[model samples]
Target: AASCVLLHTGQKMPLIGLGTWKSEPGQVKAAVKYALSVGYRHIDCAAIYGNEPEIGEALKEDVGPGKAVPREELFVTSKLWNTKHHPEDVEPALRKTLADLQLEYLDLYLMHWPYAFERGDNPFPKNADGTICYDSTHYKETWKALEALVAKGLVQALGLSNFNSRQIDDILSVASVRPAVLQVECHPYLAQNELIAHCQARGLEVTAYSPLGVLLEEPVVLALAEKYGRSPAQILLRWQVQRKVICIPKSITPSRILQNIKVFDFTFSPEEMKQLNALNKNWRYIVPMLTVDGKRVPRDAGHPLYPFNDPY
Candidate 1:
């Protein structure tokens, strides 16, 4: 049986998805095609990844002729970049991602980050001082634009990525369509129990981006790996599965891709679950770049919408 969770919007999202971040170019298309053939029904991508055009090719070959899966059944997602958070730019930015991914409508579209960079063609616009510049565009205005995309039928579900609870509250204050998903870095090390509980209480399902932690040396995970006779990575993904959160693990190797999603076979004991929870140190593996060359950075910290400054 396919392991999936029902979204706030009542759509089924496969518990395990293929993540495309840092996916080496030229190899992702085959990875995607073979993943679908094996059982993958969800693909997590973003405009900044610079590989969607190739993923689009896999979409055509697999969903079109590979016949691995039906397009309607696959939960395809692409994110809006920080460069295009302006109200007037959100639609065009999402349109470009859709065109690159070769989709008519996205299963889910996320505002990549809470903060914005100066609007331009450059993916990472750097200032002369080697720090990044910021765009004062309010996320509230950007949220309005995302809502319009739903109304226009361009995106089926809307979400926020790397957004904290306070920022979510700001969006919820005025969100007419309501965000159905909240994507963030989650793993046993960063359990995010409070934030996960908050979003769940409000009816929003969560997606764990880095389901596997950055470091593999944790004794807790290592011990569980041996006891379950599963890899440490599988232990991490399985932990998220037990909590009803979606997981997206990125791997270009066919064997690893297949291995990552084989998560439903084992269950963690209640003691093991609490043991995993105890692993949380409120740690984070990803956050906007903070300092550069021994100097303070500006793009994220200088902006009002930066999500990490809060406790959530």
Candidate 2:
């Protein structure tokens, strides 16, 4: 049976998805095709990832007439980038993603972050002073726009990524369509226990990105892999699935892709789960940083909508 989490929207999202961050255009298409052949039904993508067109090609071949998978059998997710958070820009952005992904509508569409960036064709609009040009659109406004997407059948469900608890609550206050999933960086090291609890209590499911994050090398993970006769990646992914958190582990290699979805076959005990949970240090590996005057700083540090400043 496929392990899935039932969203408040009444959609069931597969526990294991294929993440497409940093997947290059030339290579991602084949990777996606291989993943599908190996039984991966959920694919996590973002417009900013810049490879949706290639993924679209894979989708067209694998989910069409005489294909291995059907449209309804697959769960496709993509996100709104920080640059397109304006209420007006939201639908246009999603339309572009749908066009690129060769889909009529998305399984889930997310506001990629709480903050907004300067609106334009440029993915990263920066200032001459070497700082990001921050747009002041409130995330609630963006949430409203996402709800419109659902109303128009452009997306099946709406979600948020990289949002803090307070920001989520703020959206909740004004939302007609509540966010179904909260996507964030998570692994054994940056185990977001409090945030996970906050989202789940609000009837929002959580999706974990970067789920492996230096964990395969960790002593505990390695020991568990040996104990279970499983790959280190499988051990880590299993732990997250056991906690009821969705995991999207990116891999372009075919063998690893097959290994990743094999996680559902095994089990982890409560004591072993604690052993992994105890490894949390609140360390985030994907912080956005930039060089300015020979020094590196958090890219969104002082912006009004900067999310990392808040405690989860």
Candidate 3:
């Protein structure tokens, strides 16, 4: 596959990267090793995934001894979790991620979410009134610390995940270092067309998560799969790449992982792309911003960073 979009800082990101969410400890190391061997140059990891050590081990093995690939040839990304969004916690959390990954610096480090929670507490923090906790104070402070990371050479670029347009605008208002990328859920079923255009206008690269619409079993996607003679997953992923959005597809199975990276060989027709556009029912699998305390929150009354406008 060709190279993905380049960050404003000139870091080359792979268009298709491996996502290590929900991967078990014992399996992650082998998965990373297999992915690297299969030509995957990008790996998206996080402390929340609880497999950084395994991923680090795989990277070391791949580049160690007499290996041909160097550390600089790979793009490694990790995220700062919600609990550690406090100003002082920022650098420490990133340093911990680096230590876990066994890397001196990261290609990209993102603020996992806009909201901040207490350490080891609820991933989704709520106030005493059972309402979502909105902490602008912590986020701005966190951004400053992230900017300092670049100055100190801890990360090549800084970015955000699961942030909305308004929240991104607020960061731009006071940020000494602008975000180089925005990671979000995107697919033909939930294209996020407006957000993609907006980010591109600001010179920020967009990364698509859930590009295959949760799985190949979706009904509309299955129908398309039957009609086009291609797997639903492939159709959806190809759409993302054609739109120039970086895509990360998660698969523990070796064959599936290799198949996920094979979409670069073909192109979707304009009419086929239009058919995909019409299949949009605004579906989403990882609607992290919608669930609060196990209850669904109304989109308008929810956190300012929440982006979903419809039930998933």
Candidate 4:
């Protein structure tokens, strides 16, 4: 893997990309526009974010013919939301996302989560008790729909998100066109070494979302930043690509956005990488937990398809 990984049909996704999670609307479009103008090629987005149309406005001048960059020059990605996991809804859902993003097809598309929500106008419908309602649709059916998305040229490559190793194994067993990528929460604190190696061994690219997850001010990261004369975020981003894993960090501020992608100029020694890797202690700042009656409970703890029933 050089600086990028080749996807199906010869698309090389950048090892470093801009993440759009939690990016504000007013800033997201400008952030995307600036990122694209400044040489950022891969952009990670999703319909659930409720800002695809804003992002698409930034992409219009860069993608398609008569643009600064061709459609193939940029690797745009989006995910299928949980509510639309039914086999009958996959393509329609994807088409809507494409329409919002103003792209005819996605460079990469993924099932946002294994669990499905009740199919309705509300994407995140809830029960009267304030708990989420699960539709209990089999993920295998959703996976089949994703395969059809690729077959129909709606997506150049297909993959999974928030899926664990065991979940990935299940999908692989039944998959005809194997998953090209697996997006998951990963950082120094929760490095997920086992799952990373698991997906890599199977020829699927692994993207680590939240690479700087809650470790920006940690003493270890700060020390590394001081050693490299870089921002803590830059040190962390460098660590991921050095490990051959894709990194997608989001920032609404312009300076931070540029600073985030400037990590390629430096290289971390194997020993330094090991030192950062040693920070893993199975801790997570963005835990998948929902508060209920003053207790923080795992969101999908009761669901059979939950990635981690117990603490991850």
Candidate 5:
């Protein structure tokens, strides 16, 4: 466990959280319960993950009526799915997530992405021409509705995920409540240093997802793992935390989960930090799902925060 960071809304959030992405619906509940039992105070979740109810059920069972742990002690976060980003659906979609998670309110809520799709359609919407669609209009309207959620007391804080600086600035222009967090992919290979600095410059907390990079077996990572006598996964996570960004790493194996939390016991020196920084190759595991002119539009082209010349 580590100290929590105070949000602009005057609420605190744990720097480390258990990411629930890709966790099977059947096993999510047990996994969440086990993590809570091991002193995990932050649980990162999303409607797209399709396991909110399972995680909610575990929370209910573990923190039943008259339990010692209060809801305020747990920092729970969820996101609005892309297909539900229409103005009218924004708050209702979040309310549905709250109901599904069985929580009265969320500590934080985020717009899952900058792209928008037709309501009730696939997350990656197809254009009217039967191709991929990209609508910034719906995203702006959705963000306005998200601001209203804070006033309604449905969420303690509001933020954005997988958003670039230009997208964030677009939201902020009309936003009454400034974003409190920016959740993005961050790892040693894609340290995202420039993006991190930009977010911090704007007074937003950076939440690093994919902290251990993807489930790849790169030679550099394997060699580091052997040299440090640590799992490659742990090394990636440790690097993110040292960078002062909040990190959420996922794990199902009980032993690996336990090992992930043991990172605080050791410290990386300045030279060691530089060694990890030197490993940057701008590799990114997640990319946008948009297509332009019959070609897959690379994410860097659309992202304002990322350097145009950098190929990741």
Candidate 6:
């Protein structure tokens, strides 16, 4: 049970999932296959990553009849992109993701973000002047659409990604089907302790993306790694799991892939956890940005639905 986190929906999600974000097409196929072969049971994916089809190929080879792992043994997650947040578009978008992954259903499906973009094929539909084509369709409306997917069994559980505490409460106020998890950027620098506590108190588990967050280079983490005779990445991941948070650290190398899951074998002291907790600086590495004339700017900062304006 230590290896899995129990969701409110009564599902057991493996705490350490293999992240497919930023995993390029040519490399993802092998990375996925190898990850499964070496005891990785959870694979986190998103349609916007543009690599689901290749991951499907790996699943085809490794997760079916006569394969090493059965479909039931693997926990797969995917997200709906911003352009498809319209209530009318939710089902079709999920269908496309299911088709791409060659699966009948997903273990968990997350609303990629709290906001919506203009409905279209282009993920980031831009205005004539090169600004983000923001849509006013409220996330509550989109959440209703996601809840429908759960009733139909297309998605086993629902979760939120990149949503602030206030937005989550907003969803909770209206949600008939409560969210099971909150997946967001987390690490030593951006510890997000209050946010994690808030979600946990509300019965939603937290999942940490980008869990290493350059802290591996820190002298403290390096010293702890030496003290524990483990890799710095493992030290960071161990901290996450110890806090009962799910972690998905992406890596394409075979050795690192294998190394990432060997975290169940050690424990850090309370003092060390306190030391790591003190590393929080409220720093965030991932933010929505748009390219305008070869310069990056906040994608939708001033929009009413922008998520990062709050303290949480």
**Top model by lDDT, which number?**
6
Candidate 5 TM-score versus the reference: 0.86
C-alpha lDDT of candidate 6 relative to the true structure: 0.91
For candidate 1, list the clashing residue pairs, or say none.
none
On the 0 to 100 scale, the lDDT of residue 183 in model 6 is 94
For residues 200-223, could you state the per-residue lDDT of candidate 5 as single tens digits?
A: 778899999888774347666676
The TM-score of candidate 1 is 0.95
Best by TM-score: 2
Which is better, 1 or 4, measured by lDDT?
1
Q: Judge candidate 4 against the unseen true structure and give its global Cα lDDT, from 0 to 1.
A: 0.84
Cα lDDT tens digits, model 3, 173-206, are 9988889999999877678877787787787899
**Deviation in Å, model 2, residue 86 alpha carbon:** 1.2
Per residue, candidate 2 scores C-alpha lDDT tens digits across 139-217 of 9888888888899998999989999999889999999998899999999889999999999789899999988876678
lDDT of each: 0.87, 0.90, 0.80, 0.84, 0.77, 0.91
Write down the lDDT that model 5 would get. Answer: 0.77
For model 6, state the Cα shift of residue 254 in Å. 0.7
Indicate the residue-level lDDT of 43 in model 6.
94
Clashes of 1: 0
Model 3: ten consecutive residues of lowest lDDT? 303-312
After the best TM-score superposition of candidate 1, give how far the Cα of residue 126 lies from its true spot, in angstroms.
1.6
lDDT order, best first, reads 6, 2, 1, 4, 3, 5
TM-score of each: 0.95, 0.97, 0.87, 0.95, 0.86, 0.96
> Which 10-residue span in candidate 4 carries the lowest summed lDDT?
1-10
Residue 21, model 3, lDDT:
78
Error of 2 at 153 (Å): 0.7
